[PDB]
């Protein structure tokens, strides 16, 4: 029993964490085969980072201008290149512990977790969502950038995000590993601002029905509802709709638990119209929405 | 910026995971240099749930008896022996990813990470802190026993918690990796249950100093109080007393934010009496006690 806010084991990611260098700036990179990437700000200045040109910032350095370290080692930079706001830096050494590995980009609403990195020592491991505005709610200091977020499944490790910059409410954006930011957001200190958020309404049923396999059952009612009815109540309280896509995906947690999804968002509904009134689920007084319906199921099954 | 319940990189316990099986049950064991640790309970039959002799069960194995697999490998163990509530299982093979280590008992407060694992592999990791009533609000499994908690300082895993068993409210109990179990509990399925829990009154004032630190005031008033009127009110809604030892621990915190001790205990008894009015700290709905005034500084600016 029980129901915890879960990372994968950061191991394979882990072995793949070294140190990147340029000039005055030091911040993290991930090295896999014989490439390293980082964030392609590591180039600039404080007055670069203005108004870069990255193009030709990057024309005027030369392979030894980027110390790379791995562990107590160096390792030697034998070539560099761009692709979107990525820096891939070519190394003469293959990493022994690449892990069998993918580039995905992931989807708002999606959960994964992030290895917190400072000078290529990994520092923490948490959780989080890529929120629907495309920022997410993590934890990072200066010196984080470069820090990469994935997911595990079957030892393949998915790179979903490099960590690239703080927004000015505190929460954080960043790229896929193919340069690609999530979000309308430019590696620049121009003025940035995430937009207003949502709630991830498909989460949050799947942590009710997290909720009801652990025993917390209070919020369940007679009622039940349509799509249509429960998506004009999402809308009012600034919940993402819910589509049919979402029902499917949820299929299984249904008939697990005899409440089909249906009837769990009559209870949602009835839990946005009148609050909890003193109660908690799964001890929380707020309708929590980073766990995925994959998410309760992994945590409620053994997945290893 | 930002606050999130973090655990530690795992990889180094991930390293040392393994399957221990004897006759029909399948749990998890440490393997550190040439031993391995896991729950001495893995030598009970369905007879031995309520009042096994563990002795006498011990001697009538014999290291054969103990299939320990490491991934795919299998380990030969050469020696057992029973230290406490734990089996120590001797094996012919140090692990060659054996980190720096060391074993700590903690107290009731303290947070460590817990690296769930089923059946030798590792399935996720998590933060957890020791109630004040010896247990820890985990996710367990059936096959998780032998699943451990740790920190890791600097480049050593400080070994802390060793999975053993649920109790009947859903919370869990387990041992030291000396095999001392943390609270009255036993190894035992006989009917127990934990103590009332309360609610660590030195992690939620550290957790207040971490929001004023990430910048939100909107908490505080401009009173104080003494520390005994402190504990008289925070005892009526089941905090822990707060001891001189929790204010020098605070010491730090209060020095970074200009907020002494005794006035955050004022802003925390008017958060009991008043709650949040709509209002969240470092987005939660509740005052959170798992955070203590160590892992603040670590995670804070
Ligand atoms: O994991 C619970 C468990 C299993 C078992 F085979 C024997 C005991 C147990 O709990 C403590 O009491 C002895
Ligand atoms: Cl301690
Ligand atoms: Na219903």
Not at 47 to 56: A, F, G, K, S
Not at 171 to 189: C, I, K, M, S, W
Not at 195 to 212: F, H, K, Q, R, S
Request: proline residues 4%; glycine residues 8%; contains cysteine.
């Amino acid at each position: 029993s029980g129901f915890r806010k879960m990372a994968f084991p950061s191991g394979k990611v882990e072995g793949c964490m070294v140190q990147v260098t340029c000039g005055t700036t030091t911040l993290n990179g991930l090295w896999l085969d014989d490439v390293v990437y980082c964030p392609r700000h590591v180039i600039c200045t404080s007055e670069d980072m203005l108004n870069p040109n990255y193009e030709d910032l990057l024309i005027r350095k030369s392979n030894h201008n980027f110390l790379v370290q791995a562990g107590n080692v160096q390792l030697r930079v034998i070539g560099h290149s761009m692709q979107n706001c990525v820096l891939k830096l070519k190394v003469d050494t293959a990493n022994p512990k690449t892990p069998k590995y993918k580039f995905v980009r992931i989807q708002p609403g999606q959960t994964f977790s992030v290895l917190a990195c400072y000078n290529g020592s990994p520092s923490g491991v948490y959780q989080c969502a890529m929120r629907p505005n495309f920022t997410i709610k993590g934890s990072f200091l200066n010196g984080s950038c470069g820090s990469v977020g994935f997911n595990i499944d079957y030892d393949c490790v998915s790179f979903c995000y490099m960590h690239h910059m703080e927004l000015p409410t505190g929460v954080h954006a960043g790229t896929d590993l193919e340069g690609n930011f999530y979000g309308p957001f430019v590696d620049r200190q121009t003025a940035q601002a995430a937009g207003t958020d949502t709630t991830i309404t498909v989460n949050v049923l799947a942590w009710l029905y997290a909720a009801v396999i652990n025993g917390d059952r209070w919020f369940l009612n007679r009622f039940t509802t349509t799509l249509n009815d429960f998506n004009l109540v999402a809308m009012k309280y600034n919940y993402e709709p819910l589509t049919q896509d979402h029902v499917d995906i949820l299929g299984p947690l249904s008939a697990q638990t005899g409440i089909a999804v249906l009837d769990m968002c009559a209870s949602l509904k009835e839990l946005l119209q009148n609050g909890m009134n003193g109660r908690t689920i799964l001890g929380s007084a707020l309708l929590e929405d980073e766990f995925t319906p994959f998410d309760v199921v992994r945590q409620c099954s053994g997945v290893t």
